Design a protein around this motif. Structure first.
Motif, mmCIF file in Angstrom:
data_model
loop_
_atom_site.group_PDB
_atom_site.id
_atom_site.type_symbol
_atom_site.label_atom_id
_atom_site.label_comp_id
_atom_site.label_asym_id
_atom_site.label_seq_id
_atom_site.Cartn_x
_atom_site.Cartn_y
_atom_site.Cartn_z
ATOM 1 N N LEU A 152 0.835 -1.174 0.000
ATOM 2 C CA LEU A 152 0.000 0.000 0.000
ATOM 3 C C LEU A 152 0.876 1.232 0.000
ATOM 4 C CD1 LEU A 152 -2.683 -1.150 2.607
ATOM 5 C CD2 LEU A 152 -2.920 -1.103 0.121
ATOM 6 N N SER A 153 0.503 2.226 -0.822
ATOM 7 C CA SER A 153 0.960 3.608 -0.702
ATOM 8 C C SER A 153 0.572 4.166 0.658
ATOM 9 C CB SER A 153 0.375 4.466 -1.825
ATOM 10 O OG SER A 153 0.739 5.826 -1.672
ATOM 11 N N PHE A 154 1.499 4.828 1.385
ATOM 12 C CA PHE A 154 1.156 5.566 2.593
ATOM 13 C C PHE A 154 0.172 6.695 2.279
ATOM 14 C CE2 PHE A 154 1.886 8.985 5.678
ATOM 15 C CZ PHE A 154 1.649 8.321 6.853
ATOM 16 N N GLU A 155 0.369 7.374 1.124
ATOM 17 C CA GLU A 155 -0.432 8.427 0.676
ATOM 18 C C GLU A 155 -1.908 7.979 0.529
ATOM 19 O OE1 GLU A 155 1.372 9.740 -2.929
ATOM 20 O OE2 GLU A 155 2.901 10.958 -1.926
ATOM 21 N N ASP A 156 -2.180 6.808 -0.053
ATOM 22 C CA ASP A 156 -3.538 6.478 -0.421
ATOM 23 C C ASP A 156 -4.309 5.932 0.772
ATOM 24 O OD1 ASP A 156 -2.981 7.292 -2.978
ATOM 25 O OD2 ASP A 156 -2.706 5.264 -3.782
ATOM 26 N N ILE A 157 -3.600 5.413 1.801
ATOM 27 C CA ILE A 157 -4.137 5.185 3.136
ATOM 28 C C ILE A 157 -4.512 6.493 3.814
ATOM 29 C CG2 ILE A 157 -3.582 4.447 5.475
ATOM 30 C CD1 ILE A 157 -1.824 2.231 4.137
ATOM 31 N N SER A 158 -3.674 7.556 3.714
ATOM 32 C CA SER A 158 -4.090 8.870 4.247
ATOM 33 C C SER A 158 -5.329 9.377 3.503
ATOM 34 C CB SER A 158 -2.947 9.880 4.136
ATOM 35 O OG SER A 158 -3.339 11.151 4.623
ATOM 36 N N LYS A 159 -5.389 9.324 2.077
ATOM 37 C CA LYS A 159 -6.356 10.008 1.335
ATOM 38 C C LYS A 159 -7.631 9.436 1.601
ATOM 39 C CE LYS A 159 -7.563 11.424 -3.379
ATOM 40 N NZ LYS A 159 -7.152 11.405 -4.811
#
Lengths: 387, 293
Positions: free
Chosen positions: A308-315
């Motif tokens: 997983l992208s860290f970014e797309d977990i945040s978004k």
């Protein structure tokens, strides 16, 4: 209305001749207590539909009819009803007074005949005292006194075959009450699920009992979780004919609230105060990660890989950069994960191993995965075959 | 008068001659007086010898609950010059049993509480588990419930925990003189601090595969110089290992790094595919029958 005198007296006559057994001051007396659209008895088999539905001051009279009831019917009916009827009737002081009367003896020793547990069957003489001393004692008094009553209730569960089931019922209801009594809506959610699970498929139910259990489940399910916050309640009866009263709209409100993640929606989910608890103050972060984790788990790669992208977990979770850092930090602690996320490389690289929600998009996903697993095998096989 | 040496000299000759005779109570009594004088001089080693002898004596004697308590009061004091939580913890453990049968919960609950809390200062959490697991230590008692919650808190620690702990509790964070000789308030802060710092590294190794050092210095809330040192001491002791890549400012915790692991991991992977094929085989066959029906 005549129906309590009519049904009790005719059935009472039918199942034994007369011998001190008709009782005209019983027939009139019960007549006096309940002649509405609810009756205080309906004799023998009828005692599975009418038995005390109001405070039963007929009680001393009924003790002399327990002393007739065995030969008017069976084993089970006697132990089945008269302990629960006081408890549902909210006759707490009275419940204790009847437990002094009965204590541990109603036909034991060389009367013979196998013994079960009460509130379903003719019980353990001891097991009535033990189970109900805990049920009454919890309501009355403290949590330290409760932990002590549960340990005894635990001893009695252990000490039997599982065969009559009634004792196991006693254990879940007893135990659920301690988690209600404290704060422990997650521990209570597990216990209430178990209580319903061994309640429903054997019947023996009471409108009072199913009212507590459905409402109690609804408060506990908002109040704490670990698995996911509403998918499990679509394979998890919250109102599938258990009872629909007490505004079960909240379950559906919760799924909409979980997705948006609005604060306004949290107040308008149930009602202001009961939405908050104080339970939800710790809860919203845990609940929050649950929606994010499931939504991504199905979606990101058809295979299911631990990238997983860290970014797309945040978004997707809709939270700021530090905050998600703290929330994930807790989330690895909780397990169902492992394999070792690198907090530099910005790689959420943790292993695939968790359960997957519902029978719906589990099935879609399975078809895609099947064609692929099969195709891979078939190539290897083909090549080998040929040479 | 202040003639510490003179009183001891006369007490030392007396007790030795008396030994092995003239009442078990009477002999143990001289040894307590003696240790009290010994500690002030610097005679910790003389105090340890006295301790071996009394420990055998208290064991011999039936009905000796007073004697054992008195030994405990002497014992903790000598450990305060040295610094072993293990000495104090073990002899108190044997006092637990005696306190259930003979005494009230009034005697027993401050001792239980002091023992666990002693272990909380103590830097390695591996003792702590043992004492918490206890059957009548996991059920009830207010102080019992406060310690167990701390025991969960350490697991989860991300070391923004410590000021939370420091503020929230003040009894059960400064409480002494109830089954121990005491210790400074300021000493409790020293110990607690070291213990958490280590435990943050200790979890951090498992949970995350890499963290950068800049993030890590923020998590401990600490200066790099100290962090590098807290980490350095730990890895060196070999409770755990970590490795630092200095020009990146990245701390590797490492990952699998050998063929022996990978061969066994693979043969595991097969073993799971196989099991799936049989579970799926019977499972599907079942599904089929009840389509039929």
């Amino acid at each position: 209305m005549f129906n309590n005198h009519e049904i009790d007296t005719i059935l009472s006559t039918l199942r034994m001749e007369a011998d001190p057994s008709l009782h005209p001051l019983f027939e009139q007396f019960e007549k006096f207590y309940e002649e509405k659209l609810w009756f205080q008895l309906s004799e023998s088999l009828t005692k599975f539909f009418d038995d005390a539905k109001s405070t039963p001051l007929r009680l001393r009279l009924y003790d002399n009819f327990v002393s007739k009831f065995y030969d008017k019917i069976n084993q089970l009916s006697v132990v089945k009803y008269l302990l629960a009827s006081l408890k549902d009737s909210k006759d707490f002081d009275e419940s204790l007074k009847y437990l002094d009367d009965l204590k541990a003896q109603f036909q034991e020793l060389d009367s013979k005949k196998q013994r079960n547990n009460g509130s379903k069957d003719h019980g353990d003489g001891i097991l009535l005292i033990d189970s109900e001393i805990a049920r009454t004692y919890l309501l009355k008094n403290d949590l330290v006194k409760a932990r002590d009553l549960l340990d005894d209730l635990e001893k009695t569960l252990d000490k039997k075959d599982s065969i009559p089931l009634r004792i196991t019922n006693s254990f879940y209801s007893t135990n659920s009450q301690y988690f209600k009594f404290k704060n422990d809506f997650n521990s209570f959610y597990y216990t209430s699920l178990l209580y319903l699970s061994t309640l429903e498929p054997s019947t023996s139910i009471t409108l009072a009992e199913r009212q507590q259990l459905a409402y109690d489940l609804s408060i506990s399910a908002l109040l704490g979780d670990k698995i996911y916050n509403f998918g499990e309640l679509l394979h998890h009866p919250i109102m599938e004919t258990i009872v629909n009263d007490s505004n079960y709209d909240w379950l559906f409100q919760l799924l909409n609230a979980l997705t948006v993640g609005d604060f306004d929606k949290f107040d308008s989910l149930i009602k202001v105060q009961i939405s908050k608890i104080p339970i939800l103050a710790q809860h919203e972060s845990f609940l929050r990660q649950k929606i994010c984790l499931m939504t991504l788990i199905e979606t990101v790669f058809v295979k299911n890989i631990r990238m997983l992208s860290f970014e797309d977990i945040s978004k997707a979770t809709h939270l700021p950069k530090d905050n998600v850092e703290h929330l994930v930090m807790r989330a690895i602690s909780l397990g169902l994960l492992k394999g070792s996320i690198d907090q530099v490389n910005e790689l959420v690289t943790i292993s695939w191993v968790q359960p997957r929600i519902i029978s719906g998009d589990q099935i879609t996903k399975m078809k895609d995965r099947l064609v692929e697993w099969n195709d891979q095998v078939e190539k290897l096989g083909k090549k080998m075959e040929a040479r | 008068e202040g003639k510490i040496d003179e009183a001891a000299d006369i007490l030392c000759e007396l007790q030795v001659e008396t030994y092995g005779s003239m009442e078990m109570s009477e002999k143990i009594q001289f040894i307590l007086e003696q240790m009290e004088l010994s500690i002030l001089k610097g005679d910790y080693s003389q105090a340890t010898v006295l301790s071996r002898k009394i420990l055998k004596k208290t064991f011999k004697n039936p009905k000796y609950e007073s004697l054992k308590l008195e030994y405990y009061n002497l014992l903790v004091k000598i450990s305060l010059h040295k610094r072993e939580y293990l000495e104090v913890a073990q002899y108190l453990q044997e006092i637990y049993q005696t306190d259930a049968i003979k005494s009230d919960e009034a005697k027993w609950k401050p001792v239980l509480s002091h023992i666990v809390y002693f272990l909380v200062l103590s830097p390695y959490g591996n003792l702590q588990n043992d004492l918490i697991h206890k059957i009548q230590n996991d059920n009830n008692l207010k102080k019992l419930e406060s310690q167990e919650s701390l025991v969960k808190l350490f697991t989860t620690n991300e070391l923004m925990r410590w000021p939370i702990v420091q503020k929230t509790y003040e009894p059960v964070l400064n409480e002494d003189d109830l089954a121990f000789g005491g210790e400074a308030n300021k000493h409790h802060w020293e110990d607690l601090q070291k213990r958490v710092i280590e435990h943050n590294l200790r979890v951090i190794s498992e949970y995350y595969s890499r963290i950068t050092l800049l993030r890590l210095n923020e998590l401990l809330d600490l200066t790099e110089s100290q962090t590098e040192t807290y980490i350095s001491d730990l890895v060196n002791q070999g409770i755990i290992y970590a490795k630092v890549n200095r020009p990146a400012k990245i701390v590797n915790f490492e990952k699998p790094k050998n063929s022996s692991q990978l061969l066994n991991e693979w043969s595991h992977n097969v073993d799971e595919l196989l099991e799936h094929i049989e579970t799926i085989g019977h499972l599907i066959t079942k599904e089929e029958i009840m389509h039929g029906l």
